[PDB]
Amino acid sequence: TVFRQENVDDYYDTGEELGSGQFAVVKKCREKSTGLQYAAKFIKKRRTKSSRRGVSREDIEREVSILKEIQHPNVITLHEVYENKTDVILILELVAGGELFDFLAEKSLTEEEATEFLKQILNGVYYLHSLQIAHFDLKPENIMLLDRNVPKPRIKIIDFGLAHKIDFGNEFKNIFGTPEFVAPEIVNYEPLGLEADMWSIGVITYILLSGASPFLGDTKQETLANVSAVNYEFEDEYFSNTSALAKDFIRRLLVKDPKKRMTIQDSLQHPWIKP
Numbered sequence: 001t002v003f004r005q006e007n008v009d010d011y012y013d014t015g016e017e018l019g020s021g022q023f024a025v026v027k028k029c030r031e032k033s034t035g036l037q038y039a040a041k042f043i044k045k046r047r048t049k050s051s052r053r054g055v056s057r058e059d060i061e062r063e064v065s066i067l068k069e070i071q072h073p074n075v076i077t078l079h080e081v082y083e084n085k086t087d088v089i090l091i092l093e094l095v096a097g098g099e100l101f102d103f104l105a106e107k108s109l110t111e112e113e114a115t116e117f118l119k120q121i122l123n124g125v126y127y128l129h130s131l132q133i134a135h136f137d138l139k140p141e142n143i144m145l146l147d148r149n150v151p152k153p154r155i156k157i158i159d160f161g162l163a164h165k166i167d168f169g170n171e172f173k174n175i176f177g178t179p180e181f182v183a184p185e186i187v188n189y190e191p192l193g194l195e196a197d198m199w200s201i202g203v204i205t206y207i208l209l210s211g212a213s214p215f216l217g218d219t220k221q222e223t224l225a226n227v228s229a230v231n232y233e234f235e236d237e238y239f240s241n242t243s244a245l246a247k248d249f250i251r252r253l254l255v256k257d258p259k260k261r262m263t264i265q266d267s268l269q270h271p272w273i274k275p
């Protein structure tokens, strides 16, 4: 699939940089014809077939194809796609309130503040999983706020760079996500489905409630080893005032066997969440 090959600079003006990654950079931008503001994600293309630098066109097209399907208040929307010899440029909805993660370091949240964020995450994931889309990269870095100055900010899931359609219940494709947040099946290179997202939600919930990462080791290999062994516990120093029901929610997500892990529908019906 080909994208618009006019120079993006003829239709947009770029501004502040919002984020920078392995093969991508995101810049605030403004469409000249409407004055509306967006985030322009510049993705570096592979220059040769056998190269390790840049993103393969297959991977870019998958990300674009998933973004084109989604429209939900808790997920970023795709406006336009451009490309040139060096980059594909996604013009994405502007989410300017900062990471949940950057917001995290400002406080540990109360259970109400955590569930208010968490319910929005679950609603967005429920939408994705209803469409058989696994995100595969859920972490605080990929959860951003529309406005960070209100008491209950609205969040949006960003960065569909690892997302896959799961039309056969599982995919076998290798997901190099962030060790602290990936499920054991990712660590062990096993078939992957929607269940991997539910584990990541469990990790996110643990961090929201405590300010601590449940599997984080001193090195990436230690973290991965801890994940595969389900080597975590609720430290009393961090969880002494957290409800047992919140702990129960997490415990039913941080489950090695994906088949026994809570699904997105289970998580919305769990007594900690269900109104």
Ligand SMILES: COc1cc(/C=C/c2ccc(O)cc2)cc(OC)c1
Residues within 6 Å of the ligand: 018, 019, 020, 021, 022, 024, 025, 026, 038, 039, 076, 092, 093, 094, 095, 096, 099, 141, 142, 144, 158, 159
């Ligand atoms: C390109 O690497 C990064 C991209 C992004 C994308 C941020 C972003 C911000 C606003 C949007 O509307 C869309 C993406 C974030 C990062 O750390 C937070 C790293």
